[model samples]
Target chain A: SIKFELIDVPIPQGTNVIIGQAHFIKTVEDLYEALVTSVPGVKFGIAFCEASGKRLVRHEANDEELRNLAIDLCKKIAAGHVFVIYIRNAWPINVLNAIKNVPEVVRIFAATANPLKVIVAEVEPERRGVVGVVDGHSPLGVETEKDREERKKFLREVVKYKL
Target chain B: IKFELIDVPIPQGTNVIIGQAHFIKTVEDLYEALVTSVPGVKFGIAFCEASGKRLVRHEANDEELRNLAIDLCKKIAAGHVFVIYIRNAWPINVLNAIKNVPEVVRIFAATANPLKVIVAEVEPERRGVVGVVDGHSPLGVETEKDREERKKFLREVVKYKL
Candidate 1:
């Protein structure tokens, strides 16, 4: 019998979330390499869940807290061959290309700071699989002048990104 | 009837909502929606009474926001029109409840961008909103390279840090 479940992950207070399907046991280390090499001194944690063999969540990270955070989320997700990542202090874009090129990576589900609700489907014998993710709250309303300004402030404040 | 465009103000750190509701009761109902949607929500709501005294009925927790909302309604000068200004919470958190508040007929805009409402008036006795302006004119179609960059950028926005 197949059943569906919803899993919520708020992510850490100041970190980004990345969930992807990675095939091999080496996924965690590979992603770690990609990220660190792509953005030197980047801090990140990666967790990979396997469908078979040890059937344990494997993890790697430069920061112990970030690594632990990923593993905690992955265990709760309990999905087949799914990997969860949380990173801080660097642009996620800088490492995305490298992650995408990893040989074991199959597909990336999402990369977001939005509170996430993951849709998981469980097949008794086949195990659980991720179906989709509810990235954030639905749009509540349109933009106002102040909303526009605050948005611009975040953009400019981030690094004077676009004069 | 003369059709005129009126610009709406969006105060700093605040979001404004434009809607049409046919009763002075709209003020109380919208307030209840907001409070119930999220506790400790700060807001100012003003409803343009279409009949009887025909004055603007307003209420708010913060008068600065409240007064600005009333000022906005006065400028729009339309019967049954309403404006709400809120801070400390996003419109997404409470806008649905406001819409569900029975007397609401339509929500014109709930955004954090500059806005202008098109008002229709038959002399000074009666007025209505015919439309609004928010988006700028189209620039150009997206190029293939633009698409790649846009897709990359979109994926990143959801995960970008402070």
Candidate 2:
């Protein structure tokens, strides 16, 4: 089935690594095509980016190329300049994990709670990256003393440490 | 007119009693009730903390519950009967969220607060809520006058039996 053989190699006195078998098809899309062609009729399976955690491909039966395309976009965005991330909607938790892998992204802001109709964006400025979350209402607002105290109190009072 | 309790959890002093009903249809209705009916009482409402695409959100979930508990405890400072009606039990993060709220009293259980949901609340002070009856656990109930006042204010002023 798959061309790549799964292997397990043990390094003496160091670390042992386990490499599993991977069925490398023509492309990710081919995997989808194979599944769709075999089954009489089956519709959607989500194809989202493993990195940047956004849904790049969806619906259509088997679209590995599109999936690969989505993956490629993630790789590109992850590799290049992207600082500001706008999560204008809610999405699968897996997507959040994928986006965390992206090294360039710094800030993530969500405008609304809906994901299907929401927008996911990244803004790469000139050079450096800034990562944080900003509430929708505080875009141009200044932090008052009470606001600062509350923030400090939340970080101090509400959070606990773990070992 | 009547707030019906659902998934009725054998009626504990402080477990997650989960249920939801339209107490009031509009913000004005809620405000009117709070202002006229329970002047000395304080109320805190929060949206559930979860990621989904459901329209017409039901009652608070775990995260929302935690938020509500802490918010409720802070506002109620004294000891009082805390009532949380929800459509779902959410997670323990909501349940244990009461820990962070200054004075904690009994946390009655409607459920043993679920697993992955439980993970969300573990750690750092376990800064969350706990549903315990008085004289039951090491995390004893509050006794300060302020704490007692907040509790009484909420019980008598904020909530009324349906």
Candidate 3:
């Protein structure tokens, strides 16, 4: 019988996440280098679900709590060749390009501090895989002139993108 | 054993939510639930119909996001699946409301992490998901300094504090 389900990845507040696909066993190590090289003084964790051989979720991280969290979540997800990254003090934007440039990476699904839902499909006893994702909420409507101004203020003043 | 895989590219600082629904109205209801969940949120939604014409139904408040979700659904090509992409919001802000939607059967994984969908067929043309690779492994334990860094990051860098 075929079925479908959802898997919730609990992300603590004040942190960002990056989920993507990679092709090799070295994904765990390579991404580690990619992150540390791209940004300094950041706490990050990574885990990869191996598609072949033992089909284990290979993982390594810089922070204990975040690493364990990634492992636990990956096991629950149970899809192959997928990887997750949890980071602090750095946004994915700072390191996303570096990660995408990694030789083993295939593609990225989502990267944000937003809440997420992974769409999963299953068959009979144990076959389950991620299908897609619900990134966040829907738009109420187009951004108004006031809303546009607020965005500019948030980026330039609040985020300090400008002097 | 050989298998097929589909990879979807998502933009930075955006979240993606995936779920299952039985009826066609799911496309609209989910859209409503999301708009109600957060103000000024930008998003696009797509649903894979399991019955009748079985077309991929989609809606969006933003054209680019809408097109992205539709493309993802096409790559996934699974029935009864619904995909949504959003920005300026997090899943935590809206997941509870989405879960409350009756048509939504279950949520697989909610993340901003990169993702890959693995499909395998035991029979000629039938497929199923054996499992998923969510993220990487633990490199080392958090130390006193690391913990301090984490705290400072939450407070100052991301600015959840003053």
Q: Which candidate is the best by TM-score?
A: 3
lDDT of 1 by residue, B1-162 (tens): 356789888878989999865533466667778878877788988876654445667767887988888888788876667899999888989977875564564677898788888865544454556567875677999999999878777578744322
Off by over 4 Å in 1: A144-158, B1-162
Which docking category, incorrect, acceptable, medium or high, applies to candidate 3?
incorrect
TM-score of 3: 0.52
What's model 1's overall lDDT?
0.74
- Tens digits of per-residue lDDT for model 2, A1-163: 2111111111122111110111112222433443344334332232222222342222222334333433332333332222211111121121322332233223222212211111112343312111211111101112234643543465456642111
Name the weakest run of 10 consecutive residues (lDDT summed) in model 3 chain A. Answer: A121-130
The CAPRI classification for model 2 reads as incorrect
Residue B60 displacement (Å), model 2: 6.3
lDDT of 3 by residue, A69-134 (tens): 777777776665678899988998899988866655646778988889877655433345556777
Query: What's the residue-level lDDT of A162 in candidate 3?
Result: 64
Q: Which stretches of candidate 2 lie over 4 Å from their true place?
A: A1-61, A79-163, B1-162
Candidates 1 and 2, the one with greater DockQ: 1
Q: RMSD of each candidate?
A: 19.4, 21.4, 16.9
Query: Which of 1 and 2 is the better model by lDDT?
Result: 1
Model 3 regions lying over 4 Å from their true place = A124-126, B1-162
Provide the DockQ value for model 1.
0.02
Candidate 2 lDDT at B48 equals 19
